[PDB]
Amino acid sequence: STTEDEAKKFLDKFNSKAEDLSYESSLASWDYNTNISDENVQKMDEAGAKWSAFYEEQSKLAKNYPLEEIQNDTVKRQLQILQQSGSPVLSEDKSKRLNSILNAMSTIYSTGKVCKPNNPQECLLLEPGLDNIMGTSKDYNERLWAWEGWRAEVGKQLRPLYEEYVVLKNEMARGYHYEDYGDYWRRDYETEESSGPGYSRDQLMKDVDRIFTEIKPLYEHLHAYVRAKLMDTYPLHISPTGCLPAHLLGDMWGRFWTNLYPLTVPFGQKPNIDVTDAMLNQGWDANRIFKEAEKFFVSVSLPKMTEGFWNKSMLTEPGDGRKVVCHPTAWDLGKGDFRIKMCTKVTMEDFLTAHHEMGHIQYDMAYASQPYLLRNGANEGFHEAVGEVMSLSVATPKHLKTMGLLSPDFREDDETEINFLLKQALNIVGTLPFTYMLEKWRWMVFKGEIPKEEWMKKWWEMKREIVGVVEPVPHDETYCDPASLFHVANDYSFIRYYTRTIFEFQFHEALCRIAQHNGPLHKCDISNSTDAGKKLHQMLSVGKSQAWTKTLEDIVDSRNMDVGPLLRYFKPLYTWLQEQNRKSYVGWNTDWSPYA
Ligand SMILES: *[C@@H]1O[C@H](CO)[C@@H](O[C@@H]2O[C@H](CO)[C@@H](O)[C@H](O)[C@H]2NC(C)=O)[C@H](O)[C@H]1NC(C)=O
Ligand SMILES: *[C@@H]1O[C@H](CO)[C@@H](O)[C@H](O)[C@H]1NC(C)=O
Ligand SMILES: *[C@@H]1O[C@H](CO)[C@@H](O)[C@H](O)[C@H]1NC(C)=O
Ligand SMILES: *[C@@H]1O[C@H](CO)[C@@H](O)[C@H](O)[C@H]1NC(C)=O
Ligand SMILES: [Zn+2]
């Protein structure tokens, strides 16, 4: 017979085995995460080792299958995603060296701490001490000391480890017939199967550069406004026409500017919308929050939650008989099992995180009939986008008013609108240049255009160009500041947090185009709409069987990355910032430095 039927039978056998194998592995990981002990860790390790061995064996048996002679799309994409394991391309010495380097970097990041001067015993860890310090303290010297200590503790020790890591990664990428590790990361967006506009790994960088250049005006206005607002609390630490200090962005690295909201609030006289008070007054619990989320989701013609999700997930902290580290995760155990692990409290942030997790669960249930290799999003930016569009549609005051959470006598004037827009921009807009510059620096380091003896010499250059922030103290070639982030020194991609921002606002407005919404975009509501829900479900059910460009154009009528919806959403805040910056300089000076 032909190779097509042989590959089909091989994939059928592989799926029939991997279903049960991944089911057992997911059960083990869930028993570990929900019951921390010493034997559960061993069981999870055995399950993971078995799953990895099976995956490697299937990759070896699939490598001998030619993709050129095969004409079908599903089997071709399945063999393509199966052949990309990563581990079995090198010898044992380099593999063990890379594994030891990864484990050492993870241990250094987990046990990293900063010791205050003149106190060798009072050393504070990163979480939750350093995070709280960088997010709540409004002092210059304290934040500067914390940043310098974290840098000198993490990068100074991870520099040679990161050097060997990037060397081994580039060598493995060259072994996998790839250009560099940046190519191995960008291979996720490459869909060489659509007849016509086929997306390539080189077009992704160009599209990201174009969308960054298009965001540049709004981000520059926002940065100028934040600088003008922070100039009141920092009279001699921030120049009006220069860059901003890196240790004053709300956290240790500057990924989110939300912590700067009390200092950059447009109108401090009006309080923000708070729901936890009405929830505590009306006697709300986790079950009520989840039932309200299920009702909101089924009002958009989406399926409801199954009884297994209700009697198997961990919606509340059990306590008194177990110890767990609970972070919001929408887990898919396979075979039609979907659970949510989260210690949801009676608040508003947890109220939105519940809707986020329910959207993630709905997205996972959308492709429940797709093959195991296609039981995921088309790219790494659709999951979080689908999770965030629901939170955007829920956080509107209309949903809180017509459902019994906010008083009907709440006047919605432009002050609260500007406040909400600025609060959203401090979290969504302030991360795009940071993510872009981090991914570009990592790609250029993988490609070899930045020699080691100049790595940092470039890291602080783009910081002044792309983001517009200047370092507080000069760093020589012994620091490895970029590795101070969790996602950087963990073999984790970072562009997934960028494209989602484009993929989120594109979807929302699109739904608002079907629900016949009129007026501003920040007052949209997808609830009580069957037409938009049908298109949403049809877009979510495709999973990974089709190219991401086709899935995008089947939802927003555009087969390319477009940041237009983001500008249309932030147009009110854009005009407000343009009117406010009439007495301030827009832009930053690349040559200015705080230490002169
Ligand atoms: C979706 O529509 C339904 C019905 O049109 C809304 O439900 C009503 O809420 C009012 C009070 O605001 C009650 O008096 C009605 O009895 C409710 N009807 C039903 C059938 O329950 C619902 O609030 C709408 N949802 C949103 C988010 O606007
Ligand atoms: C959790 O683990 C402990 C010991 O590891 C065991 O005694 C207990 O029954 C487990 N709980 C559940 C719900 O399985
Ligand atoms: C590809 O295979 C799937 C199932 O393996 C089948 O449903 C589909 O029709 C095939 N496509 C073509 C073009 O043969
Ligand atoms: C949920 O599962 C438990 C067993 O863990 C069972 O005792 C209980 O009856 C179940 N509840 C429902 C509503 O099925
Ligand atoms: Zn999520």
XYZ file of C-alpha atoms and ligand atoms in Angstrom:
667
model
C 0.000 0.000 0.000
C 0.939 3.674 -0.216
C 2.588 5.611 2.596
C -0.663 7.506 3.224
C -2.575 4.506 4.586
C 0.467 3.379 6.585
C 0.772 6.823 8.181
C -2.979 6.862 8.856
C -2.837 3.501 10.644
C 0.265 4.586 12.570
C -1.474 7.783 13.689
C -4.586 5.822 14.676
C -2.513 3.496 16.867
C -0.538 6.419 18.308
C -3.755 8.256 19.187
C -5.383 5.168 20.717
C -2.339 4.757 22.966
C -1.700 8.442 23.732
C -5.321 8.962 24.797
C -4.991 6.566 27.736
C -1.379 7.572 28.405
C -2.157 11.300 28.625
C -5.266 10.473 30.666
C -3.130 8.642 33.232
C -0.516 11.418 33.195
C -3.168 14.100 33.724
C -4.740 12.117 36.567
C -1.313 11.799 38.203
C -0.528 15.507 37.806
C -3.952 16.446 39.191
C -3.510 14.127 42.178
C -0.125 15.750 42.793
C -1.373 19.337 42.473
C -4.457 18.677 44.624
C -2.657 16.412 47.138
C 0.958 17.321 47.910
C 2.823 14.350 49.387
C 5.950 12.258 48.770
C 4.467 9.320 46.840
C 2.333 11.506 44.557
C 5.495 13.220 43.303
C 7.016 9.822 42.497
C 3.847 8.719 40.699
C 3.800 11.923 38.641
C 7.482 11.475 37.775
C 6.877 7.891 36.634
C 3.873 8.962 34.550
C 5.814 11.817 32.958
C 8.772 9.563 32.186
C 6.485 6.975 30.579
C 4.724 9.659 28.530
C 8.039 11.161 27.403
C 9.420 7.748 26.425
C 6.262 6.988 24.438
C 6.416 10.393 22.734
C 10.069 9.893 21.778
C 9.399 6.387 20.449
C 6.469 7.638 18.369
C 8.625 10.480 17.031
C 11.318 7.982 16.025
C 8.779 5.743 14.283
C 7.217 8.769 12.564
C 10.498 10.318 11.381
C 10.813 7.746 8.580
C 7.518 8.939 7.039
C 7.884 11.329 4.073
C 5.690 14.426 4.161
C 6.075 15.287 0.467
C 4.297 12.211 -0.908
C 1.352 12.743 1.462
C -1.368 15.057 0.137
C -3.915 15.180 2.973
C -3.744 18.132 5.357
C -4.754 16.598 8.702
C -2.263 13.713 8.658
C 0.470 16.025 7.348
C -0.038 18.542 10.160
C -0.203 15.697 12.685
C 3.118 14.196 11.584
C 4.580 17.714 11.476
C 3.632 18.503 15.078
C 4.662 14.989 16.145
C 8.153 15.149 14.612
C 9.090 18.217 16.724
C 10.154 16.612 20.012
C 13.503 18.308 20.597
C 15.377 15.871 22.833
C 16.612 12.924 20.693
C 18.997 14.697 18.308
C 22.187 14.892 20.376
C 24.426 12.572 22.363
C 24.072 11.844 26.072
C 26.814 14.168 27.358
C 25.407 17.374 25.860
C 21.865 16.307 26.779
C 22.764 15.745 30.436
C 24.736 19.006 30.463
C 21.745 20.942 29.109
C 19.408 19.271 31.607
C 21.755 20.093 34.493
C 22.036 23.704 33.314
C 18.243 24.010 33.108
C 17.807 22.501 36.578
C 20.479 24.807 38.011
C 18.857 27.884 36.460
C 15.448 26.838 37.798
C 16.858 26.238 41.287
C 18.706 29.575 41.254
C 15.533 31.407 40.229
C 13.441 29.570 42.830
C 15.858 30.018 45.759
C 17.101 33.471 44.759
C 17.088 36.054 47.527
C 18.439 39.531 48.262
C 20.160 40.402 51.542
C 19.920 43.964 52.818
C 23.246 45.671 53.624
C 24.677 45.413 57.149
C 22.294 42.464 57.685
C 23.680 39.169 56.325
C 20.879 37.136 57.958
C 17.810 39.224 57.007
C 17.604 38.032 53.402
C 14.253 38.341 51.623
C 13.100 36.068 48.809
C 11.429 37.105 45.560
C 7.884 35.940 46.328
C 6.067 37.487 48.000
C 8.558 39.922 49.527
C 10.305 41.450 46.522
C 7.068 41.453 44.515
C 5.217 43.339 47.258
C 8.152 45.745 47.625
C 8.253 46.525 43.903
C 4.464 46.757 43.645
C 3.542 48.796 46.725
C 6.580 50.792 47.882
C 6.882 54.290 46.404
C 10.500 54.846 47.491
C 13.364 55.362 45.059
C 16.273 54.072 47.153
C 14.475 50.925 48.335
C 13.318 49.907 44.853
C 16.750 50.708 43.408
C 18.479 48.568 46.043
C 16.036 45.700 45.494
C 16.503 45.827 41.716
C 20.298 45.998 41.961
C 20.410 43.116 44.434
C 18.101 40.926 42.360
C 20.186 41.635 39.251
C 23.547 40.999 40.936
C 22.129 37.792 42.462
C 20.449 36.316 39.368
C 22.274 37.536 36.263
C 25.798 37.406 37.688
C 25.280 33.702 38.421
C 23.214 32.844 35.331
C 25.463 34.519 32.724
C 27.709 31.474 32.065
C 24.785 29.084 32.527
C 22.779 31.094 29.990
C 25.792 31.131 27.653
C 26.078 27.338 27.680
C 22.280 27.086 27.427
C 22.060 29.286 24.324
C 25.030 27.447 22.800
C 23.368 24.061 23.312
C 20.029 25.399 22.053
C 21.557 26.823 18.868
C 23.429 23.551 18.321
C 20.217 21.544 18.750
C 18.384 23.885 16.368
C 21.137 23.420 13.779
C 20.754 19.677 14.331
C 17.004 19.905 13.651
C 17.625 21.570 10.248
C 16.606 24.921 11.746
C 18.398 28.254 11.527
C 18.548 29.097 15.254
C 16.486 28.623 18.414
C 14.441 31.677 17.462
C 13.404 29.761 14.354
C 12.496 26.758 16.520
C 10.255 29.059 18.563
C 8.716 30.813 15.542
C 7.969 27.451 13.873
C 4.665 27.531 15.781
C 3.267 30.318 13.575
C 4.451 28.695 10.324
C 1.527 27.089 8.454
C 2.853 25.858 5.096
C -0.409 24.154 4.113
C -2.905 26.868 3.113
C -3.282 27.236 -0.654
C -2.348 30.868 -1.234
C -1.270 33.263 1.516
C 0.968 30.852 3.417
C 2.483 32.291 6.575
C 6.240 31.936 7.048
C 8.556 32.310 10.027
C 10.136 35.440 8.522
C 6.799 37.207 7.991
C 6.059 37.019 11.728
C 8.931 39.358 12.619
C 7.873 41.825 9.918
C 4.256 41.790 11.111
C 5.372 42.314 14.713
C 7.589 45.234 13.673
C 4.712 46.766 11.698
C 2.226 46.437 14.556
C 4.798 47.898 16.960
C 5.361 50.870 14.645
C 1.581 51.335 14.485
C 1.236 51.145 18.283
C 4.192 53.570 18.735
C 2.075 56.786 18.796
C -0.406 55.582 21.429
C 2.319 53.961 23.534
C 4.429 57.126 23.303
C 1.496 59.263 24.454
C 0.831 56.862 27.338
C 4.510 56.871 28.332
C 4.610 60.675 28.250
C 1.495 60.839 30.435
C 2.921 58.331 32.928
C 6.189 60.280 33.061
C 4.364 63.576 33.629
C 2.311 61.968 36.403
C 5.334 60.368 38.092
C 7.260 63.655 37.887
C 5.235 64.854 40.891
C 6.465 62.023 43.138
C 9.983 62.060 41.612
C 11.013 65.718 41.251
C 14.741 65.016 40.784
C 14.725 61.373 39.614
C 12.799 61.678 36.314
C 13.615 64.113 33.519
C 10.677 65.494 31.486
C 12.272 64.775 28.083
C 14.267 61.619 28.880
C 13.651 57.951 29.535
C 12.114 56.403 32.655
C 13.905 54.408 35.371
C 13.494 50.654 35.034
C 12.988 50.040 38.772
C 9.947 52.375 38.830
C 7.573 50.561 36.451
C 5.443 48.805 39.092
C 7.406 45.550 39.413
C 10.921 44.118 39.213
C 11.175 43.944 35.405
C 8.515 46.350 34.125
C 6.134 43.854 32.517
C 3.008 45.542 33.915
C 2.327 49.164 34.867
C -0.875 48.450 36.815
C 0.777 49.183 40.176
C 1.300 52.743 38.914
C -2.470 53.318 38.791
C -2.806 55.078 42.201
C -0.073 57.499 41.094
C -1.313 57.969 37.504
C -5.062 57.992 38.204
C -6.917 60.499 35.971
C -9.576 61.418 38.550
C -8.723 60.323 42.087
C -11.928 61.809 43.505
C -14.107 59.094 41.982
C -13.815 55.520 43.289
C -13.473 52.594 40.914
C -16.210 50.006 40.452
C -16.065 47.582 43.387
C -18.280 44.482 43.385
C -16.959 42.438 46.331
C -18.929 44.611 48.769
C -22.271 43.857 47.106
C -21.267 40.189 46.849
C -20.499 40.004 50.574
C -23.746 41.839 51.342
C -25.853 39.503 49.176
C -24.138 36.390 50.554
C -22.126 35.269 47.531
C -19.982 32.129 47.444
C -17.813 30.325 44.897
C -20.766 28.242 43.701
C -22.780 31.403 43.018
C -19.891 32.929 41.050
C -19.467 29.784 38.959
C -23.216 29.504 38.320
C -23.329 33.147 37.217
C -20.379 32.528 34.889
C -22.082 29.436 33.458
C -25.277 31.436 32.911
C -23.360 34.227 31.165
C -21.640 31.669 28.933
C -24.840 29.777 28.072
C -26.557 33.083 27.251
C -24.055 33.342 24.370
C -25.345 29.974 23.072
C -22.318 28.120 24.466
C -22.704 24.669 26.075
C -23.016 24.356 29.836
C -20.704 22.725 32.355
C -20.940 18.972 32.855
C -21.515 17.239 36.185
C -17.957 15.903 36.113
C -16.602 19.450 36.146
C -18.845 20.244 39.121
C -17.987 17.186 41.235
C -14.323 16.765 40.209
C -12.800 20.261 40.057
C -11.373 22.091 43.081
C -13.272 25.381 43.247
C -12.542 25.986 46.949
C -9.620 25.349 49.277
C -10.428 22.079 51.099
C -8.125 22.673 54.060
C -7.690 20.791 57.347
C -6.708 17.662 55.422
C -4.487 18.795 52.553
C -1.820 21.334 51.610
C -1.818 22.725 48.068
C -0.314 25.591 46.085
C -3.424 26.738 44.207
C -3.012 28.885 41.049
C -5.871 29.326 38.544
C -5.479 26.580 35.927
C -8.114 25.186 33.557
C -6.957 21.571 33.331
C -8.076 19.129 30.624
C -7.618 15.558 31.860
C -8.771 14.064 28.551
C -11.619 11.686 27.727
C -14.105 14.497 28.278
C -12.789 15.616 31.683
C -12.350 19.352 32.295
C -11.609 20.786 35.739
C -10.564 24.123 37.234
C -8.000 24.417 40.036
C -8.271 27.835 41.686
C -8.736 29.204 45.209
C -11.451 31.632 44.163
C -12.345 34.235 46.793
C -15.414 36.470 47.050
C -13.933 39.440 45.178
C -14.024 41.063 41.743
C -10.595 39.976 40.490
C -11.521 36.384 41.328
C -14.926 37.004 39.727
C -13.147 37.860 36.467
C -10.579 35.061 36.803
C -13.461 32.589 37.123
C -14.838 33.789 33.780
C -11.329 33.578 32.306
C -10.987 29.959 33.444
C -14.486 29.135 32.181
C -13.591 30.575 28.779
C -10.428 28.468 28.774
C -12.526 25.403 29.630
C -15.002 26.203 26.845
C -12.130 26.576 24.373
C -10.714 23.217 25.477
C -14.165 21.649 25.074
C -14.518 23.178 21.599
C -11.935 20.850 20.022
C -12.811 17.808 22.163
C -13.483 15.785 18.986
C -10.222 16.740 17.257
C -7.260 14.328 17.322
C -4.881 14.502 20.270
C -2.232 16.280 18.191
C -4.856 18.843 17.113
C -6.402 19.313 20.586
C -4.862 22.760 21.008
C -5.070 26.276 19.636
C -3.874 27.175 16.165
C -1.116 29.286 17.750
C 0.106 30.087 21.261
C -1.935 33.304 21.395
C -5.541 32.141 21.048
C -6.049 30.532 24.475
C -5.338 33.683 26.482
C -7.189 35.841 23.942
C -10.346 33.727 24.267
C -9.901 33.822 28.035
C -9.541 37.607 28.076
C -12.370 38.543 25.698
C -14.870 37.040 28.155
C -13.388 39.077 31.010
C -13.567 42.189 28.820
C -17.231 41.545 28.006
C -18.039 40.830 31.671
C -16.167 43.739 33.322
C -18.548 46.288 31.715
C -20.931 48.080 34.117
C -23.943 46.920 32.083
C -23.284 43.268 32.928
C -22.924 44.195 36.602
C -26.149 46.242 36.523
C -28.534 43.975 34.585
C -27.494 40.908 36.632
C -27.860 42.237 40.182
C -24.384 43.324 41.309
C -24.334 47.122 40.883
C -26.873 49.751 41.872
C -28.968 51.071 38.946
C -28.334 54.665 40.124
C -24.639 54.563 39.120
C -24.069 57.411 36.668
C -21.600 56.507 33.906
C -19.845 59.756 33.042
C -16.667 60.207 31.009
C -14.521 60.348 34.168
C -15.076 56.675 35.007
C -14.662 55.795 31.322
C -11.260 57.506 31.185
C -10.297 55.846 34.477
C -11.207 52.382 33.173
C -9.419 53.014 29.869
C -6.240 54.102 31.665
C -6.444 51.111 34.016
C -6.731 48.813 30.993
C -3.877 50.563 29.170
C -1.540 50.294 32.169
C -1.850 46.497 31.888
C -2.375 45.811 28.178
C -0.444 48.611 26.449
C 2.483 48.816 28.884
C 3.512 45.206 28.191
C 3.610 45.243 24.375
C 6.934 47.114 23.884
C 8.534 45.137 26.718
C 7.485 41.799 25.218
C 8.514 42.937 21.732
C 11.984 44.059 22.812
C 12.529 40.926 24.920
C 11.589 38.609 22.051
C 13.648 40.628 19.556
C 16.699 40.556 21.835
C 16.317 36.802 22.339
C 15.947 36.242 18.586
C 19.019 38.356 17.813
C 21.017 36.516 20.488
C 19.959 33.175 19.002
C 20.860 34.372 15.492
C 24.348 35.457 16.577
C 24.135 39.116 15.532
C 24.972 40.094 19.135
C 28.380 38.852 20.352
C 28.609 37.788 23.983
C 31.068 40.563 24.909
C 28.351 42.996 23.796
C 25.137 41.216 24.906
C 24.271 43.675 27.675
C 25.609 46.463 25.443
C 22.581 45.736 23.253
C 20.101 44.836 26.006
C 20.082 48.373 27.404
C 20.099 49.879 23.898
C 16.726 48.527 22.757
C 15.407 49.396 26.227
C 15.948 53.037 25.269
C 14.650 52.564 21.710
C 11.713 50.138 21.792
C 10.414 50.671 25.336
C 12.040 53.990 26.256
C 13.273 53.134 29.763
C 16.829 53.714 30.998
C 18.637 51.544 33.530
C 19.270 53.120 36.952
C 22.859 51.834 37.239
C 25.331 50.800 34.507
C 25.838 47.058 34.063
C 28.985 45.485 32.622
C 29.214 42.261 30.591
C 28.998 40.104 33.738
C 25.281 40.732 34.293
C 22.538 38.669 32.654
C 19.568 40.943 33.502
C 17.222 39.452 30.841
C 17.487 36.081 32.607
C 16.019 37.684 35.752
C 12.534 36.997 34.342
C 10.733 33.730 35.033
C 9.727 33.046 31.426
C 13.236 33.794 30.129
C 15.303 31.292 32.134
C 12.722 28.509 32.012
C 12.681 27.431 28.315
C 9.440 29.366 27.830
C 8.510 31.515 24.843
C 7.477 35.136 25.351
C 5.863 36.137 22.026
C 2.689 34.295 23.064
C 1.960 37.242 25.370
C 2.293 39.670 22.437
C 0.168 38.259 19.604
C -2.672 37.512 22.033
C -3.027 41.259 22.632
C -3.629 41.642 18.900
C -5.707 38.455 18.745
C -7.896 39.512 21.691
C -9.075 42.997 20.702
C -9.583 41.768 17.135
C -12.054 39.130 18.335
C -14.031 41.274 20.801
C -14.888 44.070 18.358
C -15.682 41.403 15.761
C -18.236 39.944 18.167
C -19.485 43.490 18.764
C -19.907 43.716 14.985
C -22.277 40.733 15.091
C -24.172 41.644 18.276
C -25.184 44.975 16.648
C -23.423 46.962 19.367
C -23.662 50.745 19.030
C -21.502 53.367 20.701
C -18.071 53.040 22.290
C -16.150 49.776 22.244
C -15.422 49.683 25.993
C -19.189 49.470 26.659
C -19.783 46.379 24.511
C -21.592 43.262 25.714
C -21.628 39.838 24.047
C -24.173 38.415 26.483
C -27.718 37.712 25.264
C -26.571 37.177 21.678
C -26.932 33.932 19.718
C -25.538 35.106 16.362
C -22.147 36.080 17.795
C -22.043 32.934 19.927
C -22.467 30.721 16.868
C -19.536 32.367 15.078
C -17.459 32.190 18.268
C -18.150 28.466 18.686
C -17.439 27.790 15.004
C -14.114 29.614 15.329
C -13.183 27.814 18.556
C -14.145 24.312 17.392
C -11.524 24.215 14.620
C -8.694 23.762 17.140
C -5.497 23.234 15.144
C -6.799 21.361 12.074
C -6.593 24.590 10.032
C -4.068 27.387 9.655
C -4.278 30.255 12.132
C -4.725 32.762 9.293
C -7.835 30.931 8.079
C -9.215 30.732 11.624
C -8.563 34.460 12.049
C -10.187 35.479 8.758
C -13.186 33.269 9.547
C -13.803 35.467 12.629
C -12.557 39.008 11.931
C -12.682 38.852 8.092
C -8.907 39.482 8.026
C -6.209 36.890 7.314
C -3.373 38.975 8.783
C -2.241 40.461 12.081
C -3.933 43.852 12.501
C -3.753 46.104 15.563
C -6.517 48.350 14.186
C -9.129 47.120 16.679
C -6.828 48.083 19.569
C -6.576 51.653 18.269
C -10.342 51.778 17.706
C -10.827 50.603 21.297
C -8.375 53.086 22.832
C -9.423 56.036 20.637
C -11.221 57.782 23.563
C -8.168 57.370 25.796
C -5.981 58.338 22.827
C -7.828 61.638 22.383
C -7.804 62.234 26.144
C -4.031 61.727 26.284
C -3.537 63.943 23.225
C -5.532 66.701 24.929
C -3.684 66.247 28.236
C -0.208 66.260 26.640
C -0.680 69.778 25.229
C 1.786 71.050 27.868
C 4.205 68.092 27.869
C 6.835 66.747 25.484
C 5.902 63.493 23.735
C 8.892 61.179 23.377
C 12.031 60.104 25.187
C 15.719 60.929 24.746
C 17.898 57.880 24.060
C 21.057 59.642 25.285
C 19.773 60.710 28.713
C 20.960 58.748 31.745
C 20.074 59.087 35.446
C 23.656 58.580 36.670
C 25.015 61.091 34.108
C -30.521 38.783 29.169
O -31.937 38.876 28.957
C -32.721 38.413 30.067
C -34.169 38.491 29.640
O -34.351 39.427 28.587
C -32.415 39.255 31.303
O -33.144 38.743 32.414
C -33.917 39.520 33.243
O -33.510 40.445 34.254
C -34.587 41.229 34.788
C -33.974 42.209 35.759
O -32.863 42.883 35.185
C -35.625 40.315 35.435
O -36.723 41.097 35.889
C -36.105 39.272 34.436
O -36.969 38.342 35.079
C -34.921 38.528 33.827
N -35.372 37.585 32.817
C -35.054 36.287 32.833
C -35.607 35.461 31.712
O -34.351 35.802 33.714
C -30.922 39.226 31.602
O -30.624 40.106 32.679
C -30.125 39.641 30.370
N -28.697 39.546 30.630
C -27.858 40.578 30.485
C -26.419 40.303 30.798
O -28.245 41.683 30.118
C -3.878 12.520 49.930
O -2.664 11.815 50.220
C -2.649 11.202 51.518
C -1.278 10.593 51.696
O -0.411 10.944 50.627
C -3.776 10.178 51.622
O -3.792 9.632 52.936
C -5.114 10.835 51.312
O -6.143 9.852 51.284
C -5.059 11.550 49.965
N -6.310 12.240 49.702
C -7.122 11.919 48.691
C -8.373 12.737 48.567
O -6.862 11.007 47.911
C -7.834 13.404 5.395
O -8.067 12.379 6.373
C -9.283 12.548 7.116
C -9.319 11.448 8.150
O -8.051 10.819 8.283
C -10.476 12.516 6.166
O -11.670 12.758 6.904
C -10.314 13.572 5.080
O -11.366 13.458 4.127
C -8.971 13.408 4.374
N -8.784 14.460 3.387
C -8.521 14.214 2.099
C -8.356 15.419 1.222
O -8.420 13.073 1.662
C -19.942 13.668 44.075
O -18.985 12.623 44.295
C -19.026 12.071 45.620
C -17.902 11.068 45.709
O -16.636 11.710 45.773
C -20.399 11.455 45.880
O -20.453 10.979 47.219
C -21.493 12.490 45.651
O -22.774 11.879 45.769
C -21.355 13.118 44.268
N -22.350 14.162 44.078
C -23.156 14.218 43.013
C -24.123 15.363 42.981
O -23.107 13.382 42.116
Zn -5.732 31.821 30.822
